[PDB]
Amino acid sequence: PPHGELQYLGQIQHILRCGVRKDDRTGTGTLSVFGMQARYSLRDEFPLLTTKRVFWKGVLEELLWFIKGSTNAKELSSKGVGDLGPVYGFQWRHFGAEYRDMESDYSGQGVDQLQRVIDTIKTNPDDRRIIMCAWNPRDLPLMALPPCHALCQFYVVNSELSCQLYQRSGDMGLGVPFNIASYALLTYMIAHITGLKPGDFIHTLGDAHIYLNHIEPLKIQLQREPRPFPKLRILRKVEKIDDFKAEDFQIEGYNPHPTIKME
Amino acid sequence: PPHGELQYLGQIQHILRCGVRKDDRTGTGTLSVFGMQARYSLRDEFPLLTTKRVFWKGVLEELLWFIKGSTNAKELSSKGVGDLGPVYGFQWRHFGAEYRDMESDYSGQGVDQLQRVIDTIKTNPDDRRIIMCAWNPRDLPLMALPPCHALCQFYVVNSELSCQLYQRSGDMGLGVPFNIASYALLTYMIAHITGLKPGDFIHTLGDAHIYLNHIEPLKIQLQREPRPFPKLRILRKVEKIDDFKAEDFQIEGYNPHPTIKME
């Protein structure tokens, strides 16, 4: 079967050829297509794109930072990759709780969406509601009951854990490759602690767009041939999602094309 | 280009051939595939499936019922197609409001997601947050901040309004054809009141499944060749979403194959 990365490259090509001009929130232009989806297998391989070197270090370190529930930018930068407000970390572990400061103790406050997902998987794997949501902090004060930016739906069958990420919008050049790796990793972690094997990672987008200044660099990435995806190994038996450490993970066989800078 | 309905038929075929056995909430079995998407054009045509006669009357009447905000089953059945609790209608127009009884006056109570969508479209068409959500009433008392069942994201570009429906799960045999028509109609209505032309309707699914007792009837539907989609006409200029009446709509050129009963 065809290499998974061909879906991404195909989507980039489609946007360049059929995308419509549309400005973002800051009046910056993009080429846009509404409604996209791709499926990346997680069975014996990890979807870390190869037509450009993906910043794996930033992916892994940022995810661990989210899982910590931290809202302190210093804790992330300290890792080489500062109150940020109610960001993903806080929303994932203390959903619904009122935000104070990055030092406040939110134990038992709000809903722990993440642990709930893990709890639901081990208490009722057939459940159709294993869903986790995240908002753009910016939208919270904007209106009553603002819509989420993204949602993760997990699915279990035949001892395999799959995940579908639906994002309101997707920055195809910069954000997508990074997020494919990010959520594929989250699925690997959750599958590990729940004794399941990773299945598929489905990435679905609303406004899939390419920023004008990324067009030239993307046209070049498209000339590159994907190399077999690497493998992600967890060289340690972990029991709680909170116990994972960067050292517990090891990417193997990652042979990417040169780094590509996107403005 | 290929008839749009071929996506649905193709998805049915894929589930029958690759779907995995999985039980629903009641222990009833299904053939399931996680992660699906299809795109139906709404430009000069309406996606009312033809490989089986779809219950258009029920679609149109149910949608008008939702838009009314009604929670009285009698109001719908009276149309030939009774407190139901906080169902879609109530959630769409009084989102967040505490439910009492189908007679209570909820004016100004809760968030009117529907009108907000319409308001956002006419005040900022580029917005990436034109989202509306709905929950299964059943999940509300179940836990704090339960996940939604479905969400509608609208998108505007070049004077065309598109909509993407993401559903936690999809009953491929019974619910999907009906819902494709339902949300395609909603997009037509919203586009009409906002002076935009209908663009695309994107249907995305989490657990896309076929109930065991529908397999045989679906295998037969698959032997049928789709006929050109009909057209939906709005023979009246309407200004508010609440003013639409069943008579305002007229399906033309609908030449479907015989009705197919699904248990």
Short description:
Chains A, B: Its main location: nucleus. The first copy, chain A, has 263 residues and is an alpha+beta fold.
Architecture of chain A, according to CATH?
Answer: 2-Layer Sandwich
CATH topology (level 3) name of chain A:
Thymidylate Synthase, Chain A
Percentage of residues in helical conformation of chain A: 25-40%
Structural class of chain A: alpha+beta
Query: What's the level 1 CATH class of chain A?
Result: Alpha Beta
Radius of gyration of chain A: 18 Å
Main sheet properties of chain A: 6 strands, mixed
Oligomer kind: homodimer
Shape of chain A: globular
SS summary, helix count of chain A = 7
Give the tally of β-strands of chain A: 8
Helix and strand sequence of chain A: HEEHHHHEEEHEHEE
Terminal CA distance of chain A reads 34 Å
Number of domains of chain A: 1
Biggest sheet, spatial arrangement of strands of chain A: 1-2-6-5-4-3
Biggest interface between chains: A-B, 41 and 41 residues
Strand content of chain A: 15-25%
CATH-level-4 superfamily name of chain A: Thymidylate synthase/dCMP hydroxymethylase domain
Main location (chains A, B): nucleus
Active site (chains A, B): 148
Keywords (chains A, B): Cytoplasm, Disease variant, Dyskeratosis congenita, Isopeptide bond, Membrane, Methyltransferase, Mitochondrion, Mitochondrion inner membrane, Nucleotide biosynthesis, Nucleus, Phosphoprotein, Transferase, Ubl conjugation
Binding site for (6R)-5,10-methylene-5,6,7,8-tetrahydrofolate (chains A, B): 171
